[PDB]
Paper text:
Purine nucleoside phosphorylase (PNP, purine nucleoside orthophosphate ribosyl transferase, EC 2.4.2.1) has a crucial role in the purine salvage pathway. It catalyses the reversible phosphorolytic cleavage of the glycosidic bond of purine (2′-deoxy) nucleosides, generating the corresponding free base and (2′-deoxy) ribose 1-phosphate. E. coli PNP is an excellent molecular machine conducting efficient catalysis of purine nucleosides glycosidic bond cleavage. It is a homohexamer, built as a trimer of dimers, with all its subunits having the active site in the open conformation in the apo enzyme form. Monomers in each dimer mutually donate two amino acids (His4 and Arg43) to complete their active sites.
In the case of orthorhombic structures of the wild-type enzyme with two formycin molecules (WT-6(P/S)-2FA) and of the double mutant complexes with two and four formycin molecules per hexamer bound, (DM-6(P/S)-2FA and DM-6(P/S)-4FA, respectively) all six monomers are crystallographically independent, whereas in the case of hexagonal structures of the wild-type and the mutant with six formycin molecules bound by each hexamer (WT-6(P/S)-6FA and DM-6(P/S)-6FA) two halves of the hexamer are related by the crystallographic two-fold axis. The only active sites that are occupied with FA molecules in structure DM-6(P/S)-2FA are open active sites D and C from the closed-open dimer. Closed active sites A and F and open active sites B and E are filled with water molecules only. The order of filling the active sites has changed with respect to the wild-type enzyme. It is evident that changing the two most important amino acids from the nucleoside binding site, Asp204 and Arg217, completely changed the affinity and probably cooperativity of the subunits (which is reflected in the kinetic properties ). In the case of DM, which is not able to protonate the substrate independently of active site conformation, as Asp204 residue is missing in this enzyme form (replaced by Ala), the nucleoside is bound mostly in active sites adopting the open conformation.
Numbering used by the authors:
A (entry chain A), B (entry chain D), C (entry chain F), D (entry chain B), F (entry chain E): 1 to 237
E (entry chain C): 1 to 205, 219 to 237
Amino acid sequence: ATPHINAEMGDFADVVLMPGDPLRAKYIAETFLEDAREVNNVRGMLGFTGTYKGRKISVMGHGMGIPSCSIYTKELITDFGVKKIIRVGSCGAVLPHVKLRDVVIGMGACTDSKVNRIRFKDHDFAAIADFDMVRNAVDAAKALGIDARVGNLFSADLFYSPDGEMFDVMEKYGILGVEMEAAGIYGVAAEFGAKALTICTVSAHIRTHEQTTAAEAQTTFNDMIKIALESVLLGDK
Amino acid sequence: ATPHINAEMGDFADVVLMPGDPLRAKYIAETFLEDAREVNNVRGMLGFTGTYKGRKISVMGHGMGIPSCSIYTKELITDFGVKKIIRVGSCGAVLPHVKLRDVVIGMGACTDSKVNRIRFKDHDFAAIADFDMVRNAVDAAKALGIDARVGNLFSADLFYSPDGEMFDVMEKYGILGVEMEAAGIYGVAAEFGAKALTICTVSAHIRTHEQTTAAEAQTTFNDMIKIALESVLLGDK
Amino acid sequence: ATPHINAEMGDFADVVLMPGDPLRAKYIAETFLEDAREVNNVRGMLGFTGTYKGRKISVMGHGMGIPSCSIYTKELITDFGVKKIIRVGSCGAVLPHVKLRDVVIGMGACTDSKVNRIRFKDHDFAAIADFDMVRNAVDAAKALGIDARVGNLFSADLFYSPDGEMFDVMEKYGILGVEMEAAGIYGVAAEFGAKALTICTVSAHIRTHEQTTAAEAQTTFNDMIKIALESVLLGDK
Amino acid sequence: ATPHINAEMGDFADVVLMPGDPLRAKYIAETFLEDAREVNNVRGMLGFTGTYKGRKISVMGHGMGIPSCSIYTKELITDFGVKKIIRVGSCGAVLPHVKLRDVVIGMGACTDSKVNRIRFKDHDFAAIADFDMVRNAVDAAKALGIDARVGNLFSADLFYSPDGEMFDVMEKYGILGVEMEAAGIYGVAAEFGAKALTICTVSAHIRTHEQTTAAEAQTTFNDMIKIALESVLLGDK
Amino acid sequence: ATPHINAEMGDFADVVLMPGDPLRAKYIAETFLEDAREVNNVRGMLGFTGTYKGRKISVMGHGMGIPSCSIYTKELITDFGVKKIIRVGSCGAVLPHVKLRDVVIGMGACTDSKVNRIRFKDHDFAAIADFDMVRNAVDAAKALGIDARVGNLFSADLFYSPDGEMFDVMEKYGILGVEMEAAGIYGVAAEFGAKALTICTVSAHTTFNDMIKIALESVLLGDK
Amino acid sequence: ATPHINAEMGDFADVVLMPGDPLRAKYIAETFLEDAREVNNVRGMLGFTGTYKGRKISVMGHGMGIPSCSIYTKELITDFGVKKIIRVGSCGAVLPHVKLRDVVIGMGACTDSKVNRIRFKDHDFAAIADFDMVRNAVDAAKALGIDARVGNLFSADLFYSPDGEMFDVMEKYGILGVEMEAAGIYGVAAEFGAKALTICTVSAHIRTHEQTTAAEAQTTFNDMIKIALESVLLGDK
Ligand SMILES: Nc1ncnc2c([C@@H]3O[C@H](CO)[C@@H](O)[C@H]3O)n[nH]c12
Ligand SMILES: Nc1ncnc2c([C@@H]3O[C@H](CO)[C@@H](O)[C@H]3O)n[nH]c12
């Protein structure tokens, strides 16, 4: 019922988990949710709704990049009643002892995109998550015995940057992970009056050049998913 | 293979057609290509390689927005030997005499993205197509009896833009179509030394709810595909 | 000693409360700290150290504006072993449900200053607080039965802004309070590897025109101080 | 008459060739036009009108820099019925394979000027030539046995630039020639609704300070002028 | 009163000298003025009013940085009738032939602040002093046997630069001194229709009393 | 010789007056100078050297706009030993009380050009004149009974600007005259270590004011040139 999602009101839960990869969304639906059904397939951007421990939950890909996820998050918020979005992504690390498969939680997200400047009269908008969602995720990770670090992400427009020196700048200012969406989702959440959080799994070290495979990212980053799902239940109270 | 493409050198032709929707890529392979073989499916971004009138051709989705297509086009160029990219997409018009189903060829692409400023030391980089490819597309269009306009596209970062007034400015400056990728693909081609072209069909008239029927759009879609494919043959001389 | 603080290592606690007004720092030291002693008076920027429920704590003015507070925060971190800074300030509100004397906690801070762009290669640095410090303040306020909202502040360079329309944009994007330092302190904390939090008391409403007096700001905003001090004790565990 | 041109409607053809140097315009009139008459001498900016193979054609200097040529091109468009402007100039190369005496056709023009950002709400306007004019020029060149390169020029505000590093950037993104006017003329054409093209001959290699001799310059200049003139005849059909 | 100044119209003279440090304002008031009276102490930003050779004169700290002094100068101009602001500060020099202990007069002020771009539609506003005040300061200095250098200051937002990349640039383009306020004060003066001047002593690469004498005598020259 | 000046060291005085129009330079030479001889005619940009009251003085056009005058002033300073440049031009007024034929002295020059930001690492360079030259001009004018206004000029890149509202901003900030060169000349002067000044006569009121524009002054164009020349004589003493 929207230009990029062929579904109707009620087809989505009020909370949506969103990886960039629709195939990871499919994996999550098949692995963590009961009674999951596909609710969207437009442009292959798979979305599903099922239950987790009785709680109605949706998962849907948002694609790669700020412009892509801004489209889906906006539509979910304005036309499907979605109140909370939890991005469950991958990222590259720049810090020396942040390692592969570490879970990072983006309370804020830096960016080299122009979208928030366009929204905010060319000033600095601090793209932040909802505090209660951050807190829920931290508490859930603790209950699960999973380490999770909270801090700044950096949302890049260019996965292949011509400016390698910027990575030293990110490292100097404590950036936990380089991904491509958080700052955009946070801008949309503030623009349209909803709540968002980005949780990422470290899938590459930008310095050491260690990296996981495409298959590993699609189907094995499960700590962040358990954290996300349990954090919703805490939020419900 | 690359982190976003599960294939090896040789799997892709040296020319790749790219719609945003990976389902359109599959449709293109099935409809216009002989002996089509799927060569990528990471993140559901379907890619295929086949032949058109004997000529080896590939077709693969690029996803929505500059950051998404920048990843795929970079990787195709540096790791798969691709020499030419032709985006085949949709766009919205802002000019009165540009009608639904019109074909537009982006000789240049304006943008509100920051990617080319990051590349170009914060100055104005004119994101342009390769001239020969533009000319090949014009001649292929003529031989098919299809009228096409050549000029500027505008590649937006925000499909849902909070700056409605900018559309008046685009109209004032002769922008032929509003889409979300061309300026980024043109930046990648310049950065990595390849050739690119974006052709679009007008599928919407901004500030108006006018829409074409399903059969009309497929017919028009097919016309664009034919122009792109025939243009490659002309380029081969 | 440093160019703006005539004290030696050890004279400051490892946690410093910092209002913009040195006379407020004096009030706080005399009212909340036991055995308080003056440790700075350079440029009349009073700083004191004493104990709160057995915990060594310092309080010192940072003056008005990002450039002023950036000086003091840097010096405390590099030369006095300060690990945490809690700014305890005043702000003006734009949101219709925010009232005079409400306490707001700045998980992030937007800004129209150029300093973070200077630090961050002209990109958007999300100026954020330390998460644990935010949670400690939230928990302390709950234990005290004091209400407090958590979200974005906006750190202005011009208290007398010629751009009145920017306040509508701040309001649309949920800015809780307009002040003049948080984004700068958060940038310094990030640069030098320390932790910071800004808590503000609403001293004016930009829409309803209500306003506390200079005398009230100097001495009567005590809820935010109780929250700050108790949050430190929580932080110590 | 207009503030910088003392002529009347009819004194100029609907196509004007424009070198920067008014003395070069005088040379073009004497050399290529029959029955040439001087139609402007305000500020010494000589313009002439005559015929080339029966076709009415004008030639006039535009002076140095974007601000200068923007004045002349605007006035020609709004007050003298001019439809097409062909800048005929020299440029410096930054690419090793681009050689002295090569003819470059600016299908696009990059710039470090702010004039187009001012016009285009501080976004990226792709300053482009008219496609048919570009094609006419290629075809004309081919007929004359010259292979012209088509791509981006860079229009500089500073002939004596303090930023030597920018040339490396220009080279990396494939800029064919450096001059000082094209992006400005293209901006004017778009703003006031006309068509423009810039053709340049490479008279210098910026990195080595290679410089063309006087005799070879006169030869390549003539080639460029023949190309421009014959392109007009092709456009007429 | 204003939110940052607890005084009333008439408490300030129509010219105010402003050092950054309020304790320096107190020193100035005590050393140079007759019948000096404290007229502001909000936030400890001490302001005083007295006479210098029969001429009513005020002196008040403005704090460090563009945002701080922009507040105080605006309120003085719009709410206390002040017509002229003279900043009397210290600066660091980058030029070889600008000496320690030299007096520099900022006819213009560069800055890495965004405040004037906010004011001037993101274009380049040349933050300048009032010409007559510059002339008066030069002439007052001359009469005191001092050659003041007139030129550009640079007003920094970051005393502690993250990379220090601007220093060589300031030197290349002839900046006389580095401080943290002038361009802000000049922007305020332009915005609200008053006149301002920044005078600095080169404190790095009295003297202080000489600078104050130049500022005070330059006012008396202006009154003529 | 230099790329834009066919002359040798010694041909120019160490002070050069520069109008935009080279024909105006000719007029000044013939009207004001003894034993004037032409020293340059490259690109029709006439320059002359003669004496005024025994004092060796040059006069030469600079063309229109920052890029044009930046070329000439740089070449004069670095290759012809020029120490002082005085632009003598016309400007438009935006202030209601500024009269036609009033003389404006640009102690500073605002601009919408990017050249100084290029020089100054994207920060605000205050483009200022030499103080002694300003003072000499004020005294020279006063001696002739002319009260010259001293303040900011605004140097525009676009004579035909799309942003009419900016003239309101100029008026609000007390801009005395609008022209097209001062900020660029002042930038060159600072870059290459020389001294410069722009003096202008008001030739028009920009835009229509509800108010009444005062009246017209009795001051002439010849009066301004006299001021300029006499200011040189004062500076010599
Ligand atoms: N009116 C419009 N505005 C922006 N983008 C598009 C498109 C294209 O469709 C996608 C978004 O729907 C994206 O790839 C964009 O380039 N079609 N019509 C459009
Ligand atoms: N070399 C220098 N750099 C920056 N600021 C200053 C100052 C002034 O001193 C204060 C900072 O110490 C502030 O008001 C600034 O304008 N003196 N010397 C300086």
